Amino acid sequence: DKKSARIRRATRARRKLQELGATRLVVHRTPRHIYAQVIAPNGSEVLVAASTVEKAIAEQLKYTGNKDAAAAVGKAVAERALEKGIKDVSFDRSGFQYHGRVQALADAAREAGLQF
Amino acid sequence: GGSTRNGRDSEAKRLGVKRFGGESVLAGSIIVRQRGTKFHAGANVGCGRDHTLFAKADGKVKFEVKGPKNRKFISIEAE
Amino acid sequence: GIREKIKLVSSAGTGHFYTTTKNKRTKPEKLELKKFDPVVRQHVIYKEAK
Amino acid sequence: MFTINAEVRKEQGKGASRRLRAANKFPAIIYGGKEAPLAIELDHDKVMNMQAKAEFYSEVLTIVVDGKEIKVKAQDVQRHPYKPKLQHIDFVRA
Amino acid sequence: AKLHDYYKDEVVKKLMTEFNYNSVMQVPRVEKITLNMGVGEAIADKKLLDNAAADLAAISGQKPLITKARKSVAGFKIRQGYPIGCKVTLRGERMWEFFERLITIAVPRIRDFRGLSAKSFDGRGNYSMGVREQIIFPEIDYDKVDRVRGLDITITTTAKSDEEGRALLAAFDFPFRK
Amino acid sequence: MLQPKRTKFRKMHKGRNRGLAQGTDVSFGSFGLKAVGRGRLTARQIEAARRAMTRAVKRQGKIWIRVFPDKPITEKPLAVRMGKGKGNVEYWVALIQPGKVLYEMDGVPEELAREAFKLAAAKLPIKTTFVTKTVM
RNA sequence: UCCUCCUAAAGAGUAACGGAGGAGCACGAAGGUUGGCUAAUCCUGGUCGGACAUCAGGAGGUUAGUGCAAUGGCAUAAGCC
RNA sequence: GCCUGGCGGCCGUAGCGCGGUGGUCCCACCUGACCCCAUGCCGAACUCAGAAGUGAAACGCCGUAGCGCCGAUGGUAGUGUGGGGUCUCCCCAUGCGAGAGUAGGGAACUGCCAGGC
């Protein structure tokens, strides 16, 4: 299963970030959408979320789940994170590669001010 | 014939006992020989080399069973 | 005891050296590594053997 | 019919059970899955003769405790390992 | 063109019109078919790569997989695994092209099948084809190598074909017209 | 007979004999030779009691042997001193606790089974008793 | 002399000319990191492939593997690229 | 209130099997691939760009105990202390008290955020 293989790829870095007590900006990637979630180091509550399925993000984009959509979602999640006042998060690939939409989301968060 | 040979070790078990106020780096479980009977997850990650579990903060030892595999973990919690 | 002891001599002109083991039957080439030279306080090439 | 007169157990444990077996009685338990189990003691020779009667396990038995008739059925029998005698019976409520 | 045949025929008119069946995702789909070679313990051969790379680079410019062992367990003295086979699993448009060229060599000319080709019988879903006769070669030299298309080609098939199989389409060997 | 075909280890520690036996019920047959008392049942004694049984029933019915000689017993040779390693394995025993059904019998009348069990009990060292299959 | 298991009594330790086995190395990659991956075995169709060489499918789940004895490990793999 | 996705808590009362159910909300298969990138060949997978199609497979939910799993009460085994028969093993007072079985339970529960109705 592709999702199970992705979880097996993600698990090492997820436990490593759990042991460091790092606030994790996790990304979820689908063919249709992309999701970003800044989650507190306890792992149970989500501080900041920005999704492509949100209508305010999705109305400005020509296609949901694009690299431009990933840049918009990364800029939005970094804007809400800096509005909340939290900084110095660690990026979680969640089993994906650092390539394409995941890389674009992280680059947009770095450009908008979320430092890793 | 002959078969009388043997090796030596002089400790193989835990020293921290879940009330034990271990400071700094005390070996909570030295010569466990292996990271699988006890894992270190409370005060960061212990288990340096020969898998000796050691404290990383001044505090009480904590023994616990977590995970899907029912594995035993040593934690250090502050007093 | 097929492996024999060799030196690794700093290329930074100092007399500093490391020591290691090597077997010339399988690795007859000379071993070159970037190692720290504490006299120069920099990482330099270490190649030369005894 | 298979009626056994039984008494309730004042004390439970290995010492009390061995005292019963020294006084030529033996413990037993009744459970039904609907209410609390009842610990009883039985007259060993009488329940032995009912063991030797071969229809003891098939049909429904009647245990009388305090004048109350309880319809039971023998689930398992703990027997002494090398003597004919028997140590413990558990009865399921029928 | 066989991909266009699969998209076009047997599906879209009659069962869509009269009596509905559920899904074109439910009807069986031809996945990646494969071909394998089986050479011996000799390493010095280049003929295996020559034939497989010829069948691949008649259109492409790529090379086959030189496979050592999936199992990595050897009854010989060297357990590690010598390179003793080739793999080409066929791919998409080139898969349909290779399947179409196999059909247009084997089917319309009665050359290969003398008698009943099915002799070893068991049930569970395997169709490997080993011709052992050189059917086609892209170069002008038709047959100069030691191998005679002894390679196996694997098609996975639930060999039943029940409804229109036992209705009209059995298999056998009378070329007819309209 | 009745020595195991393979063993993981050639020799064992002497050990001590347990409290009470598992396998007190008559399971496969209809009659049984239960053990009353501790001891070690040598493979030769097991074979001798089996032959006495089988000839007493005239090779009719079916006989189960519920115990197996899986413990090797070492003995030092004559006129050798103490030490110098453990002795050589000589014979195989089965450790018997009170209540162990040693043998089982079916397909015979009860009195013929009792006669065969008595002739086997005369060969066994430990005290035995006759038991019958009981439903629980 | 050194290592592993049991003896050894659920902390450590613990003897015998007690019961079993190994070591006196190897590796400039078989170390580091990053990215990726998952075995043994069994049932089937095909080129000397035959019972076991290589494919493809299914079952199974670590019964594999660890440079080398044994023990404890190991999937977040410390196993493979 | 219902459904879906993400991150957890707890780790077989949590899973497997069998049967049913869901769709351009969401998610999966799916379309194409020169280009951002990859296959010791493999647009299988990893990726990227996304007109159509179906939920078939997967996944989610529900029912079913067939298998896993949990599991009493009572008894038994063992054992600390004291005492007693003992040839190698037990008994009594007292304290602790299993494992396996039995009745039974069991088709998880819950927290945060986001989306549609």
Automatic annotation (TrEMBL), chain B:
One of its GO terms (biological process) is assembly of large subunit precursor of preribosome. The gene is rpmA. SUPFAM superfamilies: Ribosomal L27 protein-like (SSF110324). Keywords: Ribonucleoprotein, Ribosomal protein. Residues 1-14 are annotated as: Disordered. GO terms for cellular component: cytosolic large ribosomal subunit. HAMAP family: Ribosomal_bL27. GO terms for molecular function: ribosome binding; structural constituent of ribosome. Gene3D superfamilies: 2.40.50.100. The lineage of its organism: Bacteria, Pseudomonadati, Pseudomonadota, Gammaproteobacteria, Enterobacterales. Belongs to the bacterial ribosomal protein bL27 family. It comes from the Bacteria. This is Large ribosomal subunit protein bL27. NCBIfam families: L27. It holds the Pfam family Ribosomal_L27. It comes from Escherichia coli.
